[PDB]
Amino acid sequence: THALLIGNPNCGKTTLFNALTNANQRVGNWPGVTVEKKTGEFLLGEHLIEITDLPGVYSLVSQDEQIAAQSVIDLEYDCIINVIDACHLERHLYLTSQLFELGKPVVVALNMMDIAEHRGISIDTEKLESLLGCSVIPIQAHKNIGIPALQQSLLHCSQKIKPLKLSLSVAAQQILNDLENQLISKGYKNSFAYYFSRRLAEGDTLAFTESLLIKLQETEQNLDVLLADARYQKIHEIVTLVQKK
Known part of the structure; x- marks a missing residue:
């Protein structure tokens, strides 16, 4: 089952990528361009999970910003792992709301909870999830906290999401x-x-x-x-x- 990994730039996206895939990852070029593509995979029981990292973008509308824009239509994928930085929620959800308009399954990985807390930022996770209509999974990718639950939530990421009203x-x-x-x-x-x-x-x-x-x-x-x-x-x-x- 194939998961695209998407977010804004500099949100620990790569760190989550590393946390999920470990040494089972590689680099090549995206097709016919110079930008490097990173792909990897992990086992989750008997289940294989393949992951394609997309270059970060604020908005789906700059060669990198372009690749992400076209991959969410070009590629064959079963779900999206939208990585959010807890410290810049409002900016980071712009992308999220756009992704929900694909009608493909999304799970949110709410990263940097530690930095969030250090800055006195408090996020009601149950409320965010209730509003957004998808699993919101708090993590600290840099410290492996939350990864197993985000993994678990991957296996049950088969329902598509409603666009925000x-x-x-x-x-x-x-x-x-x-x-x-x-x-x-x-x-x-x-x-x-x-x-x-x-x-x-x-x-x-x-x-x-x-x-x-x-x-x-x-x-x-x-x-x-x-x-x-x-x-x-x-x-x-x-x-x-x-x-x-």
């Missing part, structure tokens, strides 16, 4: 729902149409994609700005419920 203008919701339907008629599968619409809305470039993009500009609405805000408000609201100081 975002509040957009009626004008704006209208445009995203036209865009989604245009895509379905085109022949796209539902999961992908929902996801690909949001990316377009944000102004993602990655012949048919360039026609739609000018069409979104001609509505003179700045969808990108609007969608970023609605994503931000829901996320700010989740942070204010779960995190103090």
Whole structure:
């Protein structure tokens, strides 16, 4: 069973990678580019788990930032391990909310709990999980704390997640729902149409994609700005419920 590992840069993503895969890991190039790909695997009982590390990115919309953007559509994977840094929850969940729009299983690895605590940051894990609708597994990858539970949660990471409920203008919701339907008629599968619409809305470039993009500009609405805000408000609201100081 195949797990992509995703997060923002500098979140201990590599350390978690090392913690999970140990010496059973290797480096090559991503296909036809210079960026190095790291892959590895671990046994979890009789179960094999393969893991592909993605280069960190704030947002799915810069050669590295590009690889991650296309791998979550290009690759065949069964679930995502979204690594979050507890100390920068609000930023790090921007990516998370975007990932939930893939309709693929996600488990959150809530890393740096020790640094979080040292900085007087307290996170209600049960509440974050209740809000986000996926396992949220507190860890300290650098110290191997939490790894076994995150491993355990991998075996039961087969349910897909709901996009977060975002509040957009009626004008704006209208445009995203036209865009989604245009895509379905085109022949796209539902999961992908929902996801690909949001990316377009944000102004993602990655012949048919360039026609739609000018069409979104001609509505003179700045969808990108609007969608970023609605994503931000829901996320700010989740942070204010779960995190103090």
